[PDB]
Enzyme design. Structure first.
Site, PDB file in Angstrom:
ATOM      1  N   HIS A  17       0.814  -1.225   0.000  1.00 38.93           N
ATOM      2  CA  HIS A  17       0.000   0.000   0.000  1.00 38.93           C
ATOM      3  C   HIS A  17       0.858   1.292   0.000  1.00 38.93           C
ATOM      4  O   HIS A  17       0.336   2.384  -0.243  1.00 38.93           O
ATOM      5  CB  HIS A  17      -1.012  -0.020   1.162  1.00 38.93           C
ATOM      6  CG  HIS A  17      -0.483   0.524   2.440  1.00 38.93           C
ATOM      7  ND1 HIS A  17      -0.083  -0.289   3.506  1.00 38.93           N
ATOM      8  CD2 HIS A  17      -0.301   1.809   2.835  1.00 38.93           C
ATOM      9  CE1 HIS A  17       0.326   0.484   4.512  1.00 38.93           C
ATOM     10  NE2 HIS A  17       0.200   1.784   4.111  1.00 38.93           N
TER      11      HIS A  17
ATOM     12  N   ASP B  33      -0.080  -7.413   2.307  1.00 41.99           N
ATOM     13  CA  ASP B  33       0.398  -6.014   2.159  1.00 41.99           C
ATOM     14  C   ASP B  33       1.893  -6.041   2.161  1.00 41.99           C
ATOM     15  O   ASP B  33       2.560  -5.747   3.190  1.00 41.99           O
ATOM     16  CB  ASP B  33      -0.161  -5.090   3.284  1.00 41.99           C
ATOM     17  CG  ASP B  33       0.093  -3.619   3.016  1.00 41.99           C
ATOM     18  OD1 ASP B  33       0.452  -3.311   1.861  1.00 41.99           O
ATOM     19  OD2 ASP B  33      -0.046  -2.789   3.961  1.00 41.99           O
TER      20      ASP B  33
ATOM     21  N   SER C 141       4.346   2.722   7.763  1.00 43.06           N
ATOM     22  CA  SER C 141       4.085   1.572   6.899  1.00 43.06           C
ATOM     23  C   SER C 141       5.295   1.128   6.144  1.00 43.06           C
ATOM     24  O   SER C 141       6.047   1.946   5.641  1.00 43.06           O
ATOM     25  CB  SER C 141       2.981   1.882   5.883  1.00 43.06           C
ATOM     26  OG  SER C 141       1.706   1.857   6.545  1.00 43.06           O
TER      27      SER C 141
HETATM   28  C1  LIG Z   1       0.518   3.051   4.827  1.00 49.60           C
HETATM   29  C2  LIG Z   1       0.879   2.992   6.346  1.00 49.60           C
HETATM   30  O1  LIG Z   1       1.686   4.110   6.664  1.00 49.60           O
HETATM   31  C3  LIG Z   1      -0.318   3.026   7.342  1.00 49.60           C
HETATM   32  C4  LIG Z   1      -0.061   2.339   8.656  1.00 49.60           C
HETATM   33  C5  LIG Z   1      -0.924   2.780   9.822  1.00 49.60           C
HETATM   34  C6  LIG Z   1      -0.670   1.788  10.971  1.00 49.60           C
HETATM   35  N1  LIG Z   1      -1.552   2.103  12.087  1.00 49.60           N
HETATM   36  C7  LIG Z   1      -1.388   1.744  13.392  1.00 49.60           C
HETATM   37  N2  LIG Z   1      -2.268   2.122  14.319  1.00 49.60           N
HETATM   38  N3  LIG Z   1      -0.414   0.952  13.819  1.00 49.60           N
HETATM   39  N4  LIG Z   1      -1.405   2.315   6.749  1.00 49.60           N
HETATM   40  C8  LIG Z   1      -2.574   2.873   6.462  1.00 49.60           C
HETATM   41  O2  LIG Z   1      -2.856   4.035   6.702  1.00 49.60           O
HETATM   42  C9  LIG Z   1      -3.568   1.977   5.783  1.00 49.60           C
HETATM   43  C10 LIG Z   1      -3.505   2.271   4.274  1.00 49.60           C
HETATM   44  C11 LIG Z   1      -4.903   2.537   3.815  1.00 49.60           C
HETATM   45  C12 LIG Z   1      -5.635   2.946   5.083  1.00 49.60           C
HETATM   46  N5  LIG Z   1      -4.906   2.322   6.200  1.00 49.60           N
HETATM   47  C13 LIG Z   1      -5.308   2.063   7.452  1.00 49.60           C
HETATM   48  O3  LIG Z   1      -4.572   1.577   8.305  1.00 49.60           O
HETATM   49  C14 LIG Z   1      -6.716   2.383   7.846  1.00 49.60           C
HETATM   50  N6  LIG Z   1      -6.584   3.223   9.032  1.00 49.60           N
HETATM   51  C15 LIG Z   1      -7.587   1.126   8.128  1.00 49.60           C
HETATM   52  C16 LIG Z   1      -7.726   0.249   6.885  1.00 49.60           C
HETATM   53  C17 LIG Z   1      -8.417   0.688   5.768  1.00 49.60           C
HETATM   54  C18 LIG Z   1      -8.528  -0.083   4.614  1.00 49.60           C
HETATM   55  C19 LIG Z   1      -7.945  -1.340   4.607  1.00 49.60           C
HETATM   56  C20 LIG Z   1      -7.259  -1.817   5.732  1.00 49.60           C
HETATM   57  C21 LIG Z   1      -7.165  -1.014   6.854  1.00 49.60           C
END
Ligand SMILES: *C[C@@](*)(O)[C@H](CCCNC(N)=[NH2+])NC(=O)[C@@H]1CCCN1C(=O)[C@H](N)Cc1ccccc1
Ligand SMILES: *[C@@H]1O[C@H](CO)[C@@H](O)[C@H](O)[C@H]1NC(C)=O
Ligand SMILES: [K+]
Ligand code: NA
Lengths: 258, 34
Positions: free
Chosen positions: A43, A99, A205
């Site tokens: 992602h 992912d 991420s």
């Molecule tokens: C891409 C990364 O930086 C980030 C990680 C966030 C990790 N969060 C915590 N609390 N440890 N990922 C994201 O932001 C991902 C990408 C798309 C949206 N997303 C989410 O985590 C959403 N908050 C929830 C989600 C939405 C759609 C599909 C799966 C999870």
DNA sequence: GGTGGTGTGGTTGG
């Protein structure tokens, strides 16, 4: 990273910064797994719902870093990308199943005190260490808090951040969220009653969830920061791509060419 | 091809390689008992 | 500055 603290120098020499050529911005983390291969989350590169679809030329990676923004002369190494391989069954429509992505560097990088690859896990290491209550370490330059709503504090850290977090039992993970969980994922974090805190956050991420093997003293990447809901909320847990379960694919790609 | 690095993977030049523990690795190890 | 600034060390030059 939320409620981590500053990383020490050379504490994760496999940390990689995934950096957009123009505009210049930190996109994500990633890990160095050899001299020419970097692991990250899919992602970070490809998420259609947010109209995101990066190609090799859009991107650089920066290795050896500690400071978030300063170019660290004679320390860090900047590399261009030859090829991006996204898991062919990465599920971006729904829940980010699988992912994970690999990025092959155009030129192998030299190791140094600040640049050194991490190990991928084997069946025995995965089986010894991937257990509820066992703690791994997460690292990144991601957000220090929830930035999308008014909150006090700086958004980003000046330097690399680390936190140590316990793997959580699968049924708790399941009930913590309405999002469909799969065996290609696991979750980590302190329970509310544990009164210790910490979480990865947006921007982290792709960064590695690592564990140190007490049998050989080596750091192994068990996970990739994948997703969460909020950051560091009581009753929620960070989700991570299960590296070992995706190992076969990792290896198939990495060993495909000479 | 994997390339260079594996034989020595997961051993940090400024820590394992100099028999130095970082400030918190011990917290991990203690989580692995029981 | 080139990449900040409890600036010529530091995780590295001048
Ligand atoms: C891409 C990364 O930086 C980030 C990680 C966030 C990790 N969060 C915590 N609390 N440890 N990922 C994201 O932001 C991902 C990408 C798309 C949206 N997303 C989410 O985590 C959403 N908050 C929830 C989600 C939405 C759609 C599909 C799966 C999870
Ligand atoms: C991403 O963009 C490339 C063009 O570089 C295109 O051919 C490919 O289909 C894209 N995939 C998606 C899901 O958008
Ligand atoms: K300077
Ligand atoms: Na939490």
């Amino acid at each position: 990273i939320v409620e981590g603290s500053d990383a020490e120098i050379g504490m994760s020499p496999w940390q990689v910064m995934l950096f957009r050529k123009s505009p210049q911005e930190l996109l994500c983390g990633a890990s160095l797994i050899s001299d020419r291969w970097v692991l990250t989350a899919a992602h970070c590169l490809l998420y259609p719902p947010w109209d995101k679809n990066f190609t090799e030329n859009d991107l650089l990676v920066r290795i050896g870093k500690h400071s978030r923004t300063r170019y660290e002369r004679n320390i860090e190494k900047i590399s261009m990308l030859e090829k991006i391989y996204i898991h062919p069954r990465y599920n971006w429509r729904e829940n980010l199943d699988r992912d994970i992505a690999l990025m092959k560097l155009k030129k192998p990088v030299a190791f140094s005190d600040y640049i050194h690859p991490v190990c991928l896990p084997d069946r025995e290491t995965a089986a010894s260490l991937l257990q509820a209550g066992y703690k791994g370490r997460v690292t990144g330059w991601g957000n220090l808090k929830e930035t999308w709503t008014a909150n006090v504090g700086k958004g980003q850290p000046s330097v690399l951040q680390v936190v140590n977090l316990p793997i959580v039992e699968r049924p708790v993970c399941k009930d913590s969220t309405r999002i469909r969980i799969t065996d290609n994922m696991f979750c980590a974090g302190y329970k509310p009653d544990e009164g210790k805190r910490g979480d990865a956050c947006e921007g982290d991420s792709g960064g590695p969830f690592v564990m140190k093997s007490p049998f050989n003293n080596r750091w192994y990447q068990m996970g990739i920061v994948s997703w969460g809901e909020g950051c560091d909320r009581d009753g929620k847990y960070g989700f991570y791509t299960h590296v070992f379960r995706l190992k076969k694919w990792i290896q198939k790609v990495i060993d495909q060419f000479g | 091809t994997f390339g260079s690095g594996e034989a020595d993977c997961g051993l940090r030049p400024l820590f394992e390689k100099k028999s130095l523990e970082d400030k918190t690795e011990r917290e991990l190890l203690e989580s692995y008992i029981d």
